[PDB]
Design a protein around this ligand. Structure first.
Ligand SMILES: [Fe+3]
Length: 451
């Protein structure tokens, strides 16, 4: 009923985040927020899955989302793109994955997750021209203002190795949450600056797509994903109707994060039910749904105003791609009472950026050694480590130079004309590929001082 206390240091986190002079404004903003939430989340609940933005791969011209799709995607924080990959190609990839899993050990496994990272179908999927295209189009929804200095190149996609899911009917399920850290959004300096507009009482002007500060955020100050992903995503390897062992989302990005970020300050709902009776809590170290040191923020217990907004995604067809913003609440369906396997291949957007240089190095090292990337490799014992085989084949990259750069296998080109942070991050990556090591702290410390 009451969220637990964390250590009392978290009280000083609260007093760092909201300035005394802004307390009145923040309180007013929380009341405005709840009124908007009840209106908009009601509409979502009454519309259902068609609320999620959806478009056809052919609608993407010149590697840009059309204007109407863009506008809906920035509001709703998720998108389903249909017909990215032909069904026949999808079938071949699915069958090759299953073969690989059956020849490289129980099948089906208990959890519906298969720790295969570098198989040929994965490498081919990741680098299919239609897949590169949709990532290019997504990358144009994000931006930075300080182009001269911010160490990010949104024109470059890196590979973060991830696994596959093949969920049989009857396999039950991990509640509503955010990934990309449990407590960091509040605790880290640069991460919390992402949400400054909310902490100042102006949630309405929070821009989820501006990356100047997030570029330097530490998602792990201490279940953990080691890369900075702007978007989570996956490619559909099966046809499954809404609710059949798929994904559920809360398709309202700004309202979601205004509520989440302020919830530690307004965690006590009043007995009156009158929104005008909330009052700020700047004292208790309560950060509901958090477990410092873990990767997920849980929303299933102390975030009740969110629940009305949760919907299944639209019917999924083979060869559709589904994206959601790193800040979008989501969960998987509890049950799968559909007619066949619900299977996806996970692939997120991971820009070339200062907090992703370690990822670039891990990907290069794991693929070259045919082992798990670090986030999974670190959970294996000595025997498992010596046994695993990941299907990595340089030739699956089809000697495409751009693909090899995504995998950390080739230095980045820096054209005569290119400058600013884009040129600089490419150079820093190249230096790391030459030396084989990197230390992020210097860059982070400099960004935070510059504050
Ligand atoms: Fe998740």
């Amino acid at each position: 009923e009451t969220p637990p206390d964390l250590d009392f240091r978290f009280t000083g986190i609260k007093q760092r985040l909201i300035k005394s002079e802004n307390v009145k404004q923040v309180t007013a903003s929380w009341k405005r927020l709840l009124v908007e939430i009840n209106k908009e989340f009601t509409e979502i609940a009454k519309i259902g899955p068609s609320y999620v933005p959806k478009c056809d791969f052919i609608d993407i011209k010149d590697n840009k989302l059309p204007q109407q799709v863009s506008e809906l995607f920035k509001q709703r924080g998720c998108l389903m793109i249909e017909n990215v990959i032909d069904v026949d190609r999808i079938d071949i990839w699915f069958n090759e994955l299953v073969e690989f899993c059956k020849t490289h050990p129980t099948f089906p496994n208990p959890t519906s997750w298969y720790n295969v990272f570098w198989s040929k179908p994965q490498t081919e999927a990741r680098f299919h021209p239609n897949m590169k295209a949709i990532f290019k189009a997504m990358s144009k929804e994000f931006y930075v203002e300080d182009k001269e200095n911010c160490l990010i190149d949104l024109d470059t996609q890196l590979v973060y190795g991830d696994r596959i899911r093949i969920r049989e009917p009857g396999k039950a399920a991990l509640p509503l949450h955010l990934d990309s850290s449990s407590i960091e959004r509040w605790e880290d300096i640069m991460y919390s600056e992402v949400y400054k507009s909310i902490f100042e009482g102006d949630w309405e002007n929070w821009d989820a797509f501006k990356l100047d500060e997030r570029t330097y955020s530490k998602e792990n100050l201490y279940t953990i994903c080691s890369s900075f992903r702007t978007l989570q995503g996956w490619l559909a390897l099966s046809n499954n109707k809404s609710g059949e062992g798929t994904l559920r989302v809360l398709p309202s990005l700004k309202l979601s994060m205004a509520y989440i970020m302020l919830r530690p300050f307004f965690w006590k709902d009043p007995e009156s039910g009158n929104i005008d009776d909330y009052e700020i809590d700047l004292i208790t170290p309560k950060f509901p749904g958090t477990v410092p040191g873990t990767g997920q923020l849980f929303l299933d217990k102390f975030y009740p105003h969110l629940h009305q907004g949760i919907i299944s995604i639209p019917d999924v067809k083979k060869g559709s791609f589904v994206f959601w913003h790193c800040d979008l609440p989501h969960e998987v369906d509890r049950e799968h009472n559909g007619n066949g396997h619900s299977s996806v291949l996970y692939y997120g957007q991971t820009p070339l950026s200062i907090t992703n240089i370690q990822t670039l190095l891990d990907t290069r090292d794991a693929f070259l050694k045919n082992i798990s990337p670090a986030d999974y490799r670190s959970q294996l014992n000595e025997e498992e480590k010596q046994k695993e085989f990941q299907g990595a084949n340089i030739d699956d990259l089809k000697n495409d130079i751009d693909s090899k750069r995504s995998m950390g296998l080739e230095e980045f080109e820096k054209p005569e004309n290119m400058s600013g942070g884009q040129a600089k991050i490419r150079s820093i990556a190249n230096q790391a590929l030459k030396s084989s090591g990197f230390n992020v702290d210097k860059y982070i410390h400099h960004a935070a001082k510059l504050e």
